[PDB]
Amino acid sequence: VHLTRIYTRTGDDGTTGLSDMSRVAKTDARLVAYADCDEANAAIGAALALGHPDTQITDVLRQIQNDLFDAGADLSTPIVENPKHPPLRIAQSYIDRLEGWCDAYNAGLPALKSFVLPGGSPLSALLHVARTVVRRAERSAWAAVDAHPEGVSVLPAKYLNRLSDLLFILSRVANPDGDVLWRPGG
Amino acid sequence: VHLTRIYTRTGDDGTTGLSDMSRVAKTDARLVAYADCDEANAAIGAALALGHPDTQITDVLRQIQNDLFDAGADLSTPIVENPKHPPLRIAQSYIDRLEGWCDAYNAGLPALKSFVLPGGSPLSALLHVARTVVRRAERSAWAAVDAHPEGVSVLPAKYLNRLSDLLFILSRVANPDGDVLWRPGG
Amino acid sequence: VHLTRIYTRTGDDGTTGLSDMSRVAKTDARLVAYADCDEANAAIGAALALGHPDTQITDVLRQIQNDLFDAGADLSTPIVENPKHPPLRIAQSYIDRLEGWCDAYNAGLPALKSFVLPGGSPLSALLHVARTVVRRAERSAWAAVDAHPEGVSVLPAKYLNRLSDLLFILSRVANPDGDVLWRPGG
Numbered sequence: 039v040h041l042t043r044i045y046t047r048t049g050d051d052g053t054t055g056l057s058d059m060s061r062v063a064k065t066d067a068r069l070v071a072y073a074d075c076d077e078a079n080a081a082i083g084a085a086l087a088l089g090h091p092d093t094q095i096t097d098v099l100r101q102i103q104n105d106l107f108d109a110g111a112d113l114s115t116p117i118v119e120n121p122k123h124p125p126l127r128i129a130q131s132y133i134d135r136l137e138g139w140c141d142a143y144n145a146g147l148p149a150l151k152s153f154v155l156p157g158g159s160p161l162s163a164l165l166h167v168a169r170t171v172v173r174r175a176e177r178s179a180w181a182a183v184d185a186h187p188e189g190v191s192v193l194p195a196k197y198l199n200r201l202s203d204l205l206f207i208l209s210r211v212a213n214p215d216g217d218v219l220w221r222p223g224g
Numbered sequence: 225v226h227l228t229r230i231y232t233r234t235g236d237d238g239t240t241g242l243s244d245m246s247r248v249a250k251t252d253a254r255l256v257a258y259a260d261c262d263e264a265n266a267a268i269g270a271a272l273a274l275g276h277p278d279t280q281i282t283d284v285l286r287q288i289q290n291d292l293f294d295a296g297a298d299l300s301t302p303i304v305e306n307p308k309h310p311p312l313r314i315a316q317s318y319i320d321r322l323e324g325w326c327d328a329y330n331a332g333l334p335a336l337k338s339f340v341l342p343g344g345s346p347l348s349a350l351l352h353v354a355r356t357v358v359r360r361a362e363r364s365a366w367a368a369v370d371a372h373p374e375g376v377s378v379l380p381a382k383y384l385n386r387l388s389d390l391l392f393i394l395s396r397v398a399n400p401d402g403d404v405l406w407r408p409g410g
Numbered sequence: 411v412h413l414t415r416i417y418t419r420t421g422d423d424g425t426t427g428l429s430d431m432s433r434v435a436k437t438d439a440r441l442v443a444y445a446d447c448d449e450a451n452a453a454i455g456a457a458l459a460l461g462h463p464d465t466q467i468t469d470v471l472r473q474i475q476n477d478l479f480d481a482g483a484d485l486s487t488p489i490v491e492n493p494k495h496p497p498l499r500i501a502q503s504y505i506d507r508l509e510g511w512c513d514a515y516n517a518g519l520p521a522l523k524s525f526v527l528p529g530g531s532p533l534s535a536l537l538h539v540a541r542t543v544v545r546r547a548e549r550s551a552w553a554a555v556d557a558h559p560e561g562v563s564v565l566p567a568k569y570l571n572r573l574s575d576l577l578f579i580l581s582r583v584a585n586p587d588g589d590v591l592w593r594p595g596g
């Protein structure tokens with residue numbers, strides 16, 4: 039990856055390049071998926087810069103941001119038989135880590151009997167924004183799997199699935215005074 | 225609604241559950257609609273947490289957040305003849321309330337002869353973000369009606385239609401010094 | 411453009427109006443494109459209001475916000491043979507200006523050998539959010555071109571293409587102490 043002049047104009051005809059340099063329409067399901075990972079990465083960035091999380095939560099979120107570029111590398115690289123060089127791929131390893139974090143940060147929390155109205159601390163509010171963008175990215179990743187059941191891995195979608203659960207847990211940790219809950223029809 | 229362990233892994237195959245436990249693809253038009261309501265709810269949360277609205281506007285926004293979970297409940301519950309239990313549904317009631325708020329908060333504002341360039345106060349800017357996310361949720365709700373003209377109600381989309389108008393009005397109330405306007409081609 | 415009562419209820423059946431008053435479904439590709447320009451405009455607004463840019467960047471972003479309504483006017487107005495009045499259209503001039511800003515703001519920056527983890531200053535983070543929303547708007551504009559290769563211009567998409575490159579450059583200028591970089595698989 040070399041970011042130099044940034045604008046190359048090779049996308050001005052509505053096509054763009056996968057990581058193997060093959061050309062796709064800018065509406066291609068695969069591009070949509072890793073573009074949505076990028077949008078999710080930016081949403082986490084806003085939680086970091088405007089929410090001012092403590093060091094431990096900062097460290098978790100920075101690792102997730104790095105994971106999301108691993109997922110984008112995966113989604114942008116077609117799966118091929120016997121590649122010349124090993125591609126970067128999401129592994130179950132990644133999802134186990136998210137689950138370990140889910141359990142650790144959920145341990146100190148009481149169960150909820152309704153949904154949370156997002157808000158409270160700036161950090162909590164921004165983690166809810168990130169949560170919903172990640173969930174949008176997950177849907178796009180499943181759509182890429184549908185379009186390419188052999189060429190696209192399911193593990194990016196699985197990673198994004200578990201990640202939005204972690205972001206919900208972290209949004210609660212970021213409101214130590216408690217959340218306001220939904221009153222159905224009230 | 226019980227939120228306990230959060231991650232269940234039952235969505236790791238790209239399917240999820242409606243409120244009646246029936247299974248749908250994670251690209252299903254109905255899921256997209258109430259997921260986008262969730263995304264809109266988070267955007268309002270950001271306006272509350274980073275925009276610091278006064279008490280009365282805070283009360284309006286918290287009621288809208290509650291309404292949006294009512295709309296998500298509606299969209300996630302297929303309409304059936306003679307249900308066992310009365311489902312939670314959006315009613316005209318809800319939209320009449322949004323209209324009453326539109327009229328009250330628009331009363332003190334002069335007419336505009338161009339579009340507003342979003343900005344100014346943090347609250348105004350965040351309300352514009354929420355406004356555009358709500359409009360995206362509205363389009364998804366109409367797409368859900370198209371895919372299920374008998375099983376999905378139109379009132380969620382109608383609520384979202386009127387809601388983005390209210391958020392525009394409130395975004396102006398949140399810039400008492402006035403907004404910067406579009407200069408076509410300038 | 412006259413903004414008065416705001417809510418008219420003429421969109422309550424899932425249809426809306428183009429600039430020529432012709433009726434389209436609220437899922438129409440053209441509407442999605444200029445609605446996404448609106449969402450991008452709001453994201454820039456948040457960067458202005460919460461990011462506190464200096465005078466030079468403020469002036470650039472306000473011009474871009476104005477451009478995006480020019481782009482929305484273009485996308486909302488079908489191209490016709492010999493129209494009665496000259497329509498507002500994006501022109502190459504707009505993109506040349508974006509390129510001039512890319513070159514000027516990128517001149518003092520070192521090349522990058524990896525991707526940036528969005529974060530740092532609020533301004534940098536919010537410019538990354540805007541960057542990814544603009545890229546989503548670009549995809550929608552290409553989708554509108556595909557649906558209407560004669561009735562929709564390519565210049566809006568081209569403008570949005572170059573614009574996300576500028577927002578990336580400005581996001582780096584807004585982190586003068588440097589960005590955190592992606593470590594593949596680390």
Ligand code: B12
Pocket residue numbers: 039040041042043044045046048055056057058059072073075076106107108109110111112114115123124125126127524525526527528541545574575576578594595
């Ligand atoms: C897909 C892609 C992205 C996607 C997804 C990338 C991701 N990882 O999430 C996203 C949306 C993030 C994107 C964004 C941008 N991009 Co981009 N991107 C591309 C692209 C096509 C692939 C880059 C990539 O991810 N390579 C990573 C891997 C897949 O490739 P590789 O380095 O060869 O690694 C291989 C092996 O060595 C192995 N591997 C490598 N490391 C490791 C580690 C381990 C552990 C393992 C097991 C394997 C392994 O895996 C790979 C298999 O081939 C490149 C073009 C290119 N071919 O470089 C453009 C490219 C780098 N992007 C570009 C640009 C400008 C950008 C943006 C600035 C666009 C914008 N305005 O927003 C942003 C920057 C984002 C940021 N925050 O920094 C330009 C740079 C142009 C220039 N000269 O300046 C390029 C060249 C595209 C172009 N227009 O020509 N992009």
Ligand code: B12
Pocket residue numbers: 152153154155156169173202203204206222223225226227228229230231232234241242243244245258259261262292293294295296297298300301309310311312313
């Ligand atoms: C659709 C859905 C959502 C949607 C829409 C929900 C909405 N209301 O907007 C959204 C996207 C918001 C969502 C998000 C989340 N969800 Co959810 N959700 C579901 C689901 C399928 C339905 C929940 C619901 O809305 N119930 C409301 C109504 C429909 O339920 P009900 O009380 O039975 O209503 C009946 C009657 O009592 C009557 N009624 C009740 N009250 C009233 C009032 C009035 C006036 C009337 C007239 C009638 C009435 O109406 C119904 C009759 O048909 C459940 C699974 C399930 N089957 O319960 C998961 C579920 C609760 N969600 C789950 C989770 C994990 C989450 C998230 C944390 C996911 C994430 N990481 O983001 C977030 C949390 C959101 C938040 N801010 O708190 C999990 C919890 C797992 C666990 N044990 O911890 C579940 C169980 C799904 C699963 N994975 O198995 N979810």
Ligand code: B12
Pocket residue numbers: 338339340341342355359388389390392408409411412413414415416417418420427428429430431444445447448478479480481482483484486487495496497498499
């Ligand atoms: C498409 C559109 C939008 C789109 C795109 C607009 C854009 N420019 O980006 C977007 C999404 C931004 C939108 C947003 C909103 N909209 Co609107 N919009 C419309 C619409 C259809 C067109 C308005 C427009 O852009 N006119 C600009 C040009 C295309 O039209 P024109 O003035 O006739 O200009 C012509 C010529 O003179 C020439 N021209 C004009 N100037 C110049 C300059 C140069 C240099 C050149 C070369 C040519 C040129 O070009 C045109 C060719 O015919 C109108 C309905 C209508 N038909 O008027 C509603 C309308 C103005 N919108 C409306 C509303 C309510 C809104 C929102 C508040 C919705 C919401 N709740 O978010 C927001 C406000 C946004 C904001 N930040 O201020 C309502 C207002 C209702 C009322 N009485 O109050 C209307 C009337 C729609 C309706 N519901 O009936 N809208």
Ligand SMILES: [K+]
Pocket residue numbers: 044045046047575
């Ligand atoms: K580029």
Ligand SMILES: [K+]
Pocket residue numbers: 203230231232233
């Ligand atoms: K879950």
Ligand SMILES: [K+]
Pocket residue numbers: 389416417418419
């Ligand atoms: K309206």
Ligand SMILES: [Mg+2]
Pocket residue numbers: 199200235
């Ligand atoms: Mg899930």
Ligand SMILES: [Mg+2]
Pocket residue numbers: 385386421
């Ligand atoms: Mg409307």
Ligand SMILES: [Mg+2]
Pocket residue numbers: 049571572
């Ligand atoms: Mg490009």
